[PDB]
Design a protein around this ligand. Structure first.
Ligand SMILES: *[C]C1(*)(*)([C](*)*)S[C]([C](C(=O)[N][C]C2=[C][C]=[C][C]=[C]2)N(*)[C@](*)(=O(*)*)[C@@](*)(*)C2(*)(*)(*)(*)=[C@](*)(*)C(*)=[C]C(*)=[C@@]2(*)*)[N@@](*)(*)[C@@]1(*)C(*)(*)(*)(*)(=O(*)*)N(*)(*)(*)C(*)(*)(*)(*)([C@@](*)(*)C1=C(*)[C@@](*)(*)=[C@@](*)(*)[C]=C1*)C(*)(*)(*)(*)([O])[C@@](*)(*)C(*)(*)(*)(*)(*)(=O*)[N@](*)(*)C(*)(*)(*)C1(*)(*)=[N@@](*)(*)C2(*)(*)(*)=C(*)(*)(*)([N@@]1(*)*)C(*)(*)(*)(*)=[C@](*)(*)C(*)=C2*
Lengths: 99, 99
C-alpha cells in the first residue's frame, strides 16, 4: 500500500492470535508493544525517547503480522502509550519512505 | 527520493542558513528541534513521548528546507535527543510510506 501522513499511520497487526492497532513509526529503531504476555524467555532493556527512559522486556524472534505481511524479529514489551512498529520490522515488509 | 529503513532516516535540513541533521519520523505528529533560537514570539506546548511529557516552545510559520524541499510551518523547540521532522512538515514535502 501507499500511505499518506495526513493522519497517523496506524495499522492492524496480528500478534499471536490477537489483533491490535499499531503505529508505523520510522523514528523508532525498535518495535515496542503495550504490556502483554508473550511466550518465551526475555531480557530487560532500557529505551529512551522524548521524556526519558522506560524499562522494557526484550523478546526475540517473534512473528508479527503487519497488514497481511508476516515478519519476524525482536519485540519489546512495556509501558508504552501506544503500540509501535519500528524499523526492525518495517524493513522486513519492504517499507520505504517516499518523496 | 526513496528512503529505506535499514538505517535511520536522517536527512539534512536547513534552517536559518544553518545546516542540521534531522530524523524523518512518521510516528511524530509535530516537528521538534533541539534547543535553538528562532524568530518571533513563542507559545507553550506540552508533548508526550515514550518516556513522559515535556514542555516545549511553539514557533509558528518557520521555514525549513528539507532535502531541498522547502516547507513553512510550526516548529517546536525543546529537549529532544535528536531533531525530528514530524507529520506536519512531512505532508508538506509530499512524503508517503510505501510497502
Ligand atoms: C509514538 C509516540 C510515543 S505517541 C506520542 C504522540 C501521541 O499520539 N500521543 C501522546 C501525546 C498526548 C498528548 C500530547 C502529546 C503526546 N504524540 C506526538 O506525536 C507528539 C510528539 C511530537 C514530536 C515528538 C514527540 C511527540 N508521541 C510519540 C513519540 O514520542 N514519537 C517518537 C518521537 C521521537 C523520536 C526520536 C527521539 C525522541 C522522540 C518516535 O516516533 C518513537 C520514539 O519513541 N522514538 C525514539 C526511540 N524509541 C525507541 C528508540 N528510540 C530506541 C529503541 C526502542 C524504541
Amino acid at each position: 500500500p501507499q500511505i499518506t501522513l495526513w493522519q497517523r499511520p496506524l495499522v492492524t497487526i496480528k500478534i499471536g492470535g490477537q489483533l491490535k492497532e499499531a503505529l508505523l513509526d520510522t523514528g523508532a529503531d525498535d518495535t515496542v508493544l503495550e504490556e502483554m504476555s508473550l511466550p518465551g524467555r526475555w531480557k530487560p532493556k532500557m529505551i529512551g525517547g522524548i521524556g526519558g527512559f522506560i524499562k522494557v522486556r526484550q523478546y526475540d524472534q517473534i512473528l508479527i503480522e503487519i497488514c497481511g505481511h508476516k515478519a519476524i524479529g525482536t519485540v519489546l514489551v512495556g509501558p508504552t502509550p501506544v503500540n509501535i512498529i519500528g524499523r526492525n520490522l518495517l524493513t522486513q515488509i519492504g517499507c520505504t519512505l517516499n518523496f
